[PDB]
Structure formats: C-alpha cells, structure tokens
C-alpha cells in the first residue's frame, strides 16, 4: 500500500471533499501518509474567498529577512525580524527587479538557481501572520475550523497555540525558504496556497526520518550536542543532492495556487517559494497522531517551545494504556506504514 512511499495527489469530488477528517482517513487508506506529504487538488467549483483585491492593507507585523550561510548543500538559515509592513509594501519589494523570480524554462532550472543562489541577496518572508483569508461561511476544509481531535486541547484546557490550533498566513517571495522540520509535537499540517507563484516541497518518508536525523547530526555535530531536537530550530537546509549522496529517500512536489498540501506525523519536509505568493496553514490531528505525540522528541534548549499535554488524548482514546503510560512503562513501537484507525471504513 504505496510501497514506494511516493508523494500522492488526489482529486476529490465535492461530495468526498466535504468531510475533512474523513478524507484524511481515506488518503491514508491509500498509503498517502507513507510519503510524509500529499497533495489534494480541490473540486473546481470550490473557492475559499471570492477575491483577494482587499488585502493590500493587511499588516505583516514581523517579516523576517532570511540570511543563509553555508556551502556544498549544507546551510544554516538565520531569520532576522524586520519592521512591520503591509502586503502592498511586501508585494512591491517581492516583484521588484532586485527580489523577483529569475527567468527559467524547466522547473529543474529554477531548482538549480535556488540551490546556487540561496546565500545571496537575502529575501524577506512575510511568515507566521495570525489570520485567515477564508470567508466565514466556507465549511469545507476551513483552516480556521477543521474539526479534528486537536480541538480537544482548547476544548478541555482553554489553551490556544498560535499557528498550531489557529491559522497562520505566509507571504512569500522568490527564494524564501522553510528549513527541514517535522511539525510541533509531530502533528499533521495543512497548507493552502491562496494565490501567486508556486511553493516547492521536499519530503522524507516518516519511515526514514531517523535516518535523516542521523545524517543531520553528523553534518552539524555542534548543534546536535546542544540540542537533541535541533532540527526543530528550523534553521537547517540540506539540498536534494546531499540527500541523494547519502542515500536518504525523498520525493519532491510543486504546489500551485489553489492546491492543498498535507504533511503527516514525523514527515520531514523543507521547501522554497517561487515568487510572490500567499499560503494559509495550521496543524491538525487524527487518532493515529496520539502515539506520535506521546513519543515526540522536543527541543529543550529554547524557552516556551510548543509542548502539548498528551494526558487528555491517552485517557480518551487509549484508556487501556493510561496507567502504563503514566507509570513510564508504555513501550508502544510506532509502525509508520499503518493508516489511522478511522480508515477502517475504507479498508472494509
């Protein structure tokens, strides 16, 4: 069931599209989670917003200039906070001669230009903006309210964690990047490209994540000694040629305006924006995530990193194991090939 662990693309009907959690269970019944990343192209008739003409006054409170240092396929990204600017001011800079997308024919050409030029002319990424560009009445795949079990955090505790159980906007320009990472608490993520130029992704199958971490630790031994989970700093960029050279399995995919990407628990991903664009993103969960949450290796070395109490999830969904888990004796081993329990419906 997706034995190659290749990135799968799905074209649901509007009927299939409507129930989000159900459709995630479906794509997992097809083995989509084995890749760490999947694409969902929604039905043509669906639109989350009638128009994006009114957003030029939207404020980007903390845009980040992305300074990259390194060579030979191994880089560290330093994200320097600049002054607030509007989307108008951002788009002006993004499309200017200095920062705009270079000319190219085949995608492999743009990809080579990215890996050649990423340490020059540091771009600005309008990242981590609190908000949603969805209209209030849109009930399908609304990143503001997906209605997954991740809602148990706020429902039970009152805790909101911005970007995790609330939506983030991302305004991109050419050569803006996201470093190799898995999600906070090894959650799933959803990413919708609202408009603009493509976003390109790389992914490592969850079943090979440990191999990527071992490799990264060798390449950056200083960082690893100061923090087990140093990839969670989201500063480490590693080219596909380096992955290939050290036998790390991976796949690539380009997301266009109007498409969704789903990332799966413990699926390492990285990528870059092609040009001026806007994405919306949040985290979510399924029952399969709970074991991943229980075993997530978290960053210790930074203050107020994202840590979600697993107690409510184990009690509700794993009552047989609760005492064992609380006694530190729950030695469950994760099988990354298995789909979430809710996929039973589609496998019967």
């Amino acid at each position: 069931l997706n034995p190659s662990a290749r990135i799968m693309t799905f074209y649901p009907t509007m009927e299939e599209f409507r129930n989000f959690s159900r459709y995630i269970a479906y794509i997992e019944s097809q083995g989509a989670h084995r890749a760490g990343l999947a694409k969902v192209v929604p039905p043509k008739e669906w639109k989350p917003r009638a128009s994006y003409d009114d957003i030029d006054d939207l404020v980007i409170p903390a845009p980040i200039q992305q300074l990259v240092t390194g060579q030979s396929g191994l880089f560290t990204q330093y994200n320097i906070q600049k002054k607030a600017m509007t989307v108008r001011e951002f788009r002006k800079i993004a499309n200017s001669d200095k920062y705009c997308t270079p000319r190219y024919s085949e995608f492999e050409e743009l990809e080579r230009k990215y890996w050649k030029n990423l340490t020059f002319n540091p771009p600005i990424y309008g990242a981590d903006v609190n908000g949603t560009l969805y209209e209030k009445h849109v009930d399908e795949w609304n990143i503001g309210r997906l209605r997954t079990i991740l809602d148990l955090v706020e429902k039970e505790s009152g805790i909101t964690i911005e970007g995790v159980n609330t939506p983030y906007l991302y305004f991109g320009m050419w050569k803006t990047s996201f470093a190799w990472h898995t999600e906070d608490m090894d959650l799933y993520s959803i990413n919708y490209l609202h408009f603009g130029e493509p976003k390109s992704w790389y992914s490592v199958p969850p079943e090979h994540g440990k191999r990527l971490e071992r490799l990264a630790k060798g390449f950056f031994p200083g960082s690893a000694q100061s923090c087990e989970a140093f990839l969670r700093h989201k500063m480490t960029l590693i080219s596909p040629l380096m992955l290939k050279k050290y036998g790390i399995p991976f796949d690539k995919v380009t997301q266009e305006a109007g498409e969704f990407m789903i990332t799966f628990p413990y699926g390492y991903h990285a990528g870059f924006n092609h040009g001026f664009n806007c994405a919306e993103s949040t985290n979510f969960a399924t029952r399969r995530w709970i074991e991943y949450g229980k075993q997530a290796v978290l960053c210790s070395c930074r203050k107020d990193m994202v840590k979600i109490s697993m107690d409510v999830f184990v009690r509700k969904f794993q009552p047989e194991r609760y005492k064992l888990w609380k006694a530190g004796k729950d030695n469950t081993v994760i099988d990354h090939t298995l789909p979430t329990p809710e996929a039973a419906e589609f496998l019967k």
């Binding site: 994200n79 990424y125 995790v164 470093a179 985290n283």
Partner: peptide, 8 residues
C-alpha cells in the same frame, strides 16, 4: 508558546 517559522 506559538508556532515559529524559524530562529536565529
């Protein structure tokens, strides 16, 4: 805590 795109 909040999600963050990266550090320095």
């Amino acid at each position: 805590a909040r999600k963050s795109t990266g550090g320095k």
